[PDB]
């Protein structure tokens, strides 16, 4: 069961979602960054450490941000076979954890990006305003992020997380 303090780690971001890692470290999908704007979570754009690649964007502030996170680990993608977890809320306030079943790390052509991802099989689905969502799994006792939400198959039973380098 995911903690309410790791629900509270997901947050609305662009035209979806990102997932605080530490209380200076936001991940999401570069694609739901929002374009032309100068200031993210009231910080100006001077003062944040971007890296960005194959859909996966990294945020790394100045200040503590979320002081009350314990910083988890972040993984590139997960071993094959892993049985995650999709921490999804909607717009509405619903919180919608996912099972999926991870398969392999590949590149990726998605609508002509260029995306470093795993995929995974659904085990209820995802809709547009998901992307950047987090993939964990508990490792123990800790929990383990990763990847954040980034595509789905055509049917929906597939979906595709973009992972870190
Ligand atoms: C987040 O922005 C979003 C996540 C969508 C999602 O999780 N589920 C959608 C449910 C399926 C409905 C049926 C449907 N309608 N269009 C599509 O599927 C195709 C969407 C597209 N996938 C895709 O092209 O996969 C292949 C056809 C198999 C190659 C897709 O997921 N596009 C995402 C945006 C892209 C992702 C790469 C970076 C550029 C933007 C998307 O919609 N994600
Ligand atoms: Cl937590
Ligand atoms: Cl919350």
């Given at each position: 069961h995911?903690?309410?303090?790791?629900?509270?780690?997901?947050?609305?971001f662009g035209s979806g979602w990102g997932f605080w890692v530490s209380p200076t470290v936001f991940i999401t999908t570069t694609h739901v960054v929002p374009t032309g704007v100068k200031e993210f979570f009231g910080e100006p754009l001077s003062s944040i450490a971007i890296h960005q690649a194959g859909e996966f964007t990294q945020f790394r502030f100045s200040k503590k941000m979320r002081?009350?996170?314990?910083?988890?680990?972040?993984?590139?993608?997960?071993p094959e076979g892993t049985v995650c977890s999709v921490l999804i809320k909607r717009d509405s306030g619903e919180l919608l954890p996912l099972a999926?079943?991870?398969?392999?790390?590949?590149?990726?052509?998605?609508?002509?990006?260029?995306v470093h991802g795993q995929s995974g099989?659904?085990?209820?689905?995802?809709?547009?305003?998901?992307?950047?969502?987090?993939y964990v799994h508990k490792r123990?006792?800790?929990?383990?992020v990763?990847?954040?939400?980034?595509?789905?198959?055509?049917?929906?039973?597939?979906?595709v997380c973009a992972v870190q380098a």
């Amino acid at each position: 069961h995911a903690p309410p303090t790791l629900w509270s780690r997901v947050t609305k971001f662009g035209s979806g979602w990102g997932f605080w890692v530490s209380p200076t470290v936001f991940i999401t999908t570069t694609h739901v960054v929002p374009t032309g704007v100068k200031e993210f979570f009231g910080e100006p754009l001077s003062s944040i450490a971007i890296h960005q690649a194959g859909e996966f964007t990294q945020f790394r502030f100045s200040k503590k941000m979320r002081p009350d996170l314990t910083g988890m680990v972040l993984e590139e993608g997960c071993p094959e076979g892993t049985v995650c977890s999709v921490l999804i809320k909607r717009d509405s306030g619903e919180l919608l954890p996912l099972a999926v079943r991870m398969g392999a790390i590949a590149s990726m052509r998605i609508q002509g990006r260029l995306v470093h991802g795993q995929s995974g099989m659904l085990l209820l689905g995802t809709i547009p305003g998901d992307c950047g969502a987090p993939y964990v799994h508990k490792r123990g006792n800790d929990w383990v992020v990763c990847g954040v939400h980034a595509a789905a198959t055509k049917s929906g039973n597939t979906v595709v997380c973009a992972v870190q380098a």
